[PDB]
């Protein structure tokens, strides 16, 4: 299973002159290129070691694509002010997500192309890559305009062609870096507490990718309501961390078991205190 994404953003701010445009590319959810208009010599920069294979002709072209998108966002931002009857002197955001999903047969599984204004969904290309979805009354002007121009055919071509073909190319070029999954190393810690109770905190550390599930069991059935957890969080080194806890009678603690479900594991982990 594989994917590519470009996550594009432009933000305007009161008083300033031109919006700031940032684009970020991801292969299999890991960052691999970046462009940022604030930089001294704005360019698409490599963002993993495996991308340094790519020659000068590659960066030059990608860089001109970015400058083009910058101009596209500029104008779009301007039109949006108009559509929403927003005056001057505020801050606005326009974001885009696009890319493609491949199954393990390396064939195109799904295409994505969606837009948000002020962090709210504005318009998106449906799964069929032929029809558009736009909720806001203000978005209808765009959707009619786009329906009558064959915008969807343009995007369809990209998503079915270059997206796929170039993801293919990238995947071959970085086999040793992007085929890894680090398994979690788990453990349970003991925190004494009020009223003859204790907190059992189940840790999972050094794992990649980030998706993971931790469940507590009272000798069999799970405990959904009484549980406490944290949002999965980066360690800073490329791996991730997460815990989940439940409150338990002192002494009567061994009939609680913690289960860790991660990808990259031979089978779910099972731990107690």
């Amino acid at each position: 299973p594989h994917s590519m994404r470009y996550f594009e953003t432009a933000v305007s701010r009161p008083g300033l002159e031109e919006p700031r445009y940032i684009s970020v590319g991801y292969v299999d959810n890991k960052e691999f290129v970046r462009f940022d208009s604030d930089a001294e010599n704005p360019r698409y920069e490599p963002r993993a070691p495996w991308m340094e294979q790519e020659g000068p002709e590659y960066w030059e072209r990608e860089t001109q694509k970015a400058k083009g998108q910058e101009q596209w966002f500029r104008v779009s931002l301007r039109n949006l002010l108009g559509y929403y009857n927003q005056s001057a002197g505020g801050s606005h955001t326009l974001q885009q997500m696009s890319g493609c999903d491949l199954g393990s047969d390396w064939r195109l599984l799904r295409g994505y192309l969606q837009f948000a204004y002020e962090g709210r969904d504005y318009i998106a290309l449906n799964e069929d890559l032929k029809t558009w979805t736009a909720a806001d009354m203000a978005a209808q002007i765009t959707r009619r305009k786009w329906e009558q121009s064959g915008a969807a055919e343009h995007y369809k071509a990209y998503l079915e062609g270059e997206c796929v073909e170039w993801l293919h190319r990238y995947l071959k070029n970085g086999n040793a870096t992007l085929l890894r999954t680090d398994s979690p190393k788990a453990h349970v810690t003991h925190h004494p507490r009020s009223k003859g109770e204790v907190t059992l905190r189940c840790w999972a550390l050094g794992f990649y990718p980030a998706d993971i599930t931790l469940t507590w069991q009272l000798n069999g059935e799970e405990l959904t309501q009484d549980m406490e957890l944290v949002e999965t969080r980066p360690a800073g080194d490329g791996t991730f961390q997460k815990w989940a806890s439940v409150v338990v009678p002192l002494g009567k603690e061994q009939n609680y078991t913690c289960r860790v479900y991660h990808e990259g594991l031979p089978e779910p982990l099972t731990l107690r205190w």
Binding site: S23, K65, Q69, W146, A151
Partner: peptide, 9 residues
């Protein structure tokens, strides 16, 4: 490979 957009919003 970066997408390039069609018509502005």
């Amino acid at each position: 490979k970066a997408l390039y957009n069609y018509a502005p919003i």
